[PDB]
């Protein structure tokens, strides 16, 4: 049951990393990133599934979420669909301090908050998420 | 007629600043022992967000506005205008760092 979900989520993690590498290589070869958009519906359907949240936090899928959220070295931001889906998934899951320590998503969140090309609604949601994550540390 | 002191954030009438000085900033601006020059540069009549504080020590608002070490009274969230460079350098000579309350610095 839970082990099958863990195996499927790890397979999804490997597929996401492979798609990110392929899209980065294609961008370096002068081609648009299409693999991330193709994989986006399955990732969205998996993330919207509530009972898989414990398995996601066990398998540290937030690291690959950060990797997708990580801007490529050409200073080009990812597609708005990817950012919106990942932000909605982050809102829908109870991210704790231990999971943030494992994934290191705070750096990318601070980058999104400080950046100006990012949409102001995404900026406000990032500010809210940073405040909520700083809340347990001080009390 | 009322003005908001740029440094400490208190709000008092301009004639009160001229006659008696700022009760908190007198130790580093010498406002009680100064002309209308320092009153005009260190206090601004254009402000927003009137704040009344009763207990500086335990008010989180006072800590957030960095006014927990000052006299209770009328305070302003935002003050138009900044302190001049010479006054900033004079404060740095005293060892006190000036953080602007104009909102433009964060």
């Amino acid at each position: 049951l839970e082990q099958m979900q863990d195996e499927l989520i790890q397979q999804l993690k490997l597929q996401m990393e492979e798609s990110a590498i392929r899209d980065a290589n294609n961008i370096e070869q002068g081609k648009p990133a299409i693999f991330k958009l193709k994989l986006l519906p399955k990732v969205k359907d998996i993330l919207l599934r509530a009972n898989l949240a414990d398995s996601i936090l066990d398998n540290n899928l937030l690291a690959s979420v950060r990797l997708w959220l990580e801007p490529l070295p050409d200073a080009s931001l990812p597609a708005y669909q990817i950012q919106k889906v990942l932000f909605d998934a982050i809102k829908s899951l109870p991210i704790k301090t231990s999971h943030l320590r494992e994934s290191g998503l705070g750096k990318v969140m601070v980058f999104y908050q400080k950046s100006k090309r990012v949409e102001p609604n995404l900026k406000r949601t990032a500010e809210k998420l940073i405040s909520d994550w700083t809340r347990p540390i001080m009390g | 007629r009322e003005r908001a002191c740029m440094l400490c954030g208190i709000v008092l009438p301009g004639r009160v600043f001229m006659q008696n000085g700022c009760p908190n900033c007198d130790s580093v601006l010498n406002l009680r022992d100064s002309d209308q020059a320092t009153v005009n540069e260190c206090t601004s009549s254009s402000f927003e967000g009137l704040v009344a504080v009763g207990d500086n020590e335990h008010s989180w608002v006072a800590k957030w506005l960095r006014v927990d070490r000052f006299q209770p009274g009328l305070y302003a969230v935002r003050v138009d205008g900044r302190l001049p460079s010479d006054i900033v350098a004079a404060l740095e000579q005293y060892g006190v760092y000036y953080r602007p309350r104009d909102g433009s610095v964060i």
């Binding site: 405040s131 001080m138 009390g139 | 989180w60 800590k63 964060i106």
Partner: peptide, 13 residues
């Protein structure tokens, strides 16, 4: 500082 002054549960309401 400024970041440390964020509100906690024990701060006055």
């Amino acid at each position: 500082p400024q970041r440390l002054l964020i509100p906690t549960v024990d701060d006055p309401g």
